[PDB]
Amino acid sequence: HMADKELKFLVVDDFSTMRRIVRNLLKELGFNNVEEAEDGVDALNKLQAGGYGFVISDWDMPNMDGLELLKTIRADGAMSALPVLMVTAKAKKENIIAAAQAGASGYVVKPFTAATLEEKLNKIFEKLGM
Ligand code: BEF
Ligand SMILES: [Mg+2]
Ligand SMILES: [Mn+2]
């Protein structure tokens, strides 16, 4: 998948406010192909419906948290390389390590600026040749 207008994003957070912020930013960056999920399970359901090229995900969520979601994705042969960008209020160095070691593509701390999200996405795009 390439970082073109068609790239399909899944945006995961248990609060719609954050989802709404991320969706509108993506639109601004020229990405209109964006779905939402409210937790890890909901997320995996949409993901298995196929088509997704990028995940942006919260951490603290009920049912299945973002760290578990990330690990599940990384451990599934069909989606093991799916980019996952964590966007979360968890800022302890030990949260960052756990997510990084689990295979996070990137990590943004809430609250964040439009500029930060764009810079972090582009950083991942470059890294993956998208
Ligand atoms: F709830 Be998330 F981790 F911001
Ligand atoms: Mg539902
Ligand atoms: Mn949350």
In the reported structure, the alpha carbon of residue 81 is separated from the centroid of ligand 2 by a whole-number distance in angstroms of: 25
Q: Which atom of ligand 1 is nearest to the CA of 87?
A: 4
CA distance 17 to 124: 24
Q: Which ligand is nearest to the CA of 88?
A: 1
Provide residues with CB under 6 Å of ligand 1: 58-60, 88-90, 110
Residue nearest to atom 1 of ligand 1 (CA): 60
Give CA 44 to chain center in angstroms: 12
DSSP readout, 52-77?
Answer: --EEEE-S--SSS-HHHHHHHHHT-T
CA–CA dist 6, 115 (Å, integer): 22
Buried b (16+ CB within 10 A) or exposed e, 94-116: ebbebbeebbbbbbbeeebeeee
Cα of 80 from ligand 2 centre, angstroms: 24
- With 0-12 / 13-18 / 19 or more C-beta atoms within 10 angstroms meaning exposed / middle / buried, residue 92 is exposed
| Alpha-carbon distance values, 10 to 29, 58, 91, 93 (Å) | 15, 11, 22, 26
| CATH fold for domain 1-130 | Rossmann fold (3.40.50)
Cβ(80)–Cβ(108) below 8 Å: no
* Ligand 1: residue whose CA is nearest its atom 4: 88
3-state secondary structure of 120: helix
What resolution in angstroms does the PDB record give?
Answer: 2.4
Query: 51 in helix, strand or coil?
Result: coil
Q: How far apart are CA 38 and CA 129, in angstroms?
A: 29
Closest ligand 1 atom to Cα of 89: 4
Residue with tokens 């009920």: 62
| Residue linked to tokens 């090229």 | 53
Tell me which residue of 61, 60, 74, 4 sits closest to 32, measured CA to CA. Answer: 4
Residue extents of the structural domains in the chain:
1-130
Tokens of 105: 């593509």
Rounded Cα distance, 113 and 71, in Å: 27
